[PDB]
């Protein structure tokens, strides 16, 4: 069923809450034993958001290999993503260790450091060129190279140096700065424009490691980003674009991380984004 007609059907009948609860009921349940070990309590932001054991990213260290991060591997679309929580004061060094070890080119941030008067993640990158950051626990140096501030997003060029080997790499930071404190955006236009800038940079392409994408918990806004990207790519690849089933794609992604798409409003917004974005994929 053309998702555009499915959309009007659900909208007129006002059944978004019912549709969303069906997804919650059918979603996969896999163990997350490592996340729940006592030694990892201060590595998790939220008690009820954990990576599954089978898809979690492992840090390359013998001490403690745990980070709250998951590999979402989309086989037909030929795209992979790492979804993670906003870094905590005690995990900023782990976060950049992951970026280094997984050979990522881009980091996608979908929240502000403070929202609703509370801290949603650590200030984990430098704000001034001449004030670099050193992460002593993981032996990395991070320098701000340039910053481009736009009305709806900011793009930063960063240099990450492995102090052990003195290799350096350029990382691109894509920061969507205008998601509202409550609800979802009224129009998907600026979110889609942002997605296309990430694509244009190479950060999603197979010559690099998977992009790292986060919000506060790494499941809601973060799930909207990867769901929209994968659905649009499938509509490009297939003979019949109307065969793409957003609910089925979301359930596939939920095999790799729990809770993706946190509200019925985020589900509706994901539909709207794919419907409007297709009016470029289909040619325009």
From Swiss-Prot:
Phosphotyrosine carried by residues: 20, 66
Changes after translation: Oxidized on Cys-215; the Cys-SOH formed in response to redox signaling reacts with the alpha-amido of the following residue to form a sulfenamide cross-link, triggering a conformational change that inhibits substrate binding and activity. The active site can be restored by reduction.
Any one GO MF annotation of this record: receptor tyrosine kinase binding
Modified residues annotated as Cysteine sulfenic acid (-SOH) in this record: 215
Modified residues (S-nitrosocysteine): 215
Residues annotated as binding substrate: 181, 215-221, 262
Enzyme Commission number(s) from the entry: 3.1.3.48
Modified residues (Cysteine persulfide): 215
Membrane spanning stretches: none
Active site per database record: 215
Domain Tyrosine-protein phosphatase: 3-277
Keyword Acetylation annotated: yes
Residue list for modification N-acetylmethionine: 1
Cellular component GO terms held in the UniProt record: cytoplasm; cytoplasmic side of endoplasmic reticulum membrane; cytosol; early endosome; endoplasmic reticulum; endosome lumen; glutamatergic synapse; mitochondrial crista
Keyword terms of this UniProt record: Acetylation, Endoplasmic reticulum, Hydrolase, Membrane, Oxidation, Phosphoprotein, Protein phosphatase, S-nitrosylation
Tissues expressing this chain: Expressed in keratinocytes (at protein level).
Family membership noted in the UniProt record: Belongs to the protein-tyrosine phosphatase family. Non-receptor class 1 subfamily.
Quaternary context: Interacts with EPHA3 (phosphorylated); dephosphorylates EPHA3 and may regulate its trafficking and function. Interacts with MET. Interacts with NCK1.
Protein name stated in the entry: Tyrosine-protein phosphatase non-receptor type 1
Organism expressing this protein natively: Homo sapiens
Source taxonomy: Eukaryota, Metazoa, Chordata, Craniata, Vertebrata
Gene this protein is translated from: PTPN1
């Amino acid at each position: 069923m053309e998702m555009e007609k499915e959309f009007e059907q659900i909208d007129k009948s006002g059944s978004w809450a019912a549709i969303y609860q069906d997804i919650r009921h059918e979603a996969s349940d896999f163990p997350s034993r490592v996340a729940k070990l006592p030694k990892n309590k201060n590595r998790n932001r939220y008690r009820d958001v954990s990576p599954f054991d089978h898809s979690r990213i492992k840090l390359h260290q013998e001490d403690n290999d745990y980070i709250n991060a998951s590999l979402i591997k989309m086989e037909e679309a030929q795209r992979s993503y790492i979804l993670t929580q906003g870094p905590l004061p005690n995990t900023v060094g782990h976060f950049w260790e992951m970026v280094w070890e997984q050979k990522s080119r881009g980091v996608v941030m979908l929240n502000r450091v403070m929202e609703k008067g509370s801290l949603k993640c650590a200030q984990y990158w430098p704000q001034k060129e001449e004030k670099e950051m050193i992460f002593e626990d993981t032996n990395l140096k991070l320098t701000l190279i340039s910053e481009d501030i736009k009305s709806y997003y900011t793009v930063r060029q960063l240099e990450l140096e492995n102090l052990t080997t003195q290799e350096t790499r350029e990382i691109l930071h894509f920061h969507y700065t205008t998601w509202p404190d409550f609800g979802v955006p009224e129009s998907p236009a600026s979110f889609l424009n942002f997605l296309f800038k990430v694509r244009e940079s190479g950060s999603l392409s197979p010559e690099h490691g998977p992009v790292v994408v986060h919000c506060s918990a790494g499941i809601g806004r973060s799930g909207t980003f990867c769901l929209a990207d994968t659905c649009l790519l499938l509509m490009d690849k297939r003979k019949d674009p109307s065969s793409v089933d957003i609910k089925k794609v979301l359930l596939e992604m939920r095999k790799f991380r729990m809770g993706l798409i946190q509200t019925a409003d985020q589900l509706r917004f994901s539909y709207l984004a794919v419907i409007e974005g297709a009016k470029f994929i289909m040619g325009d």
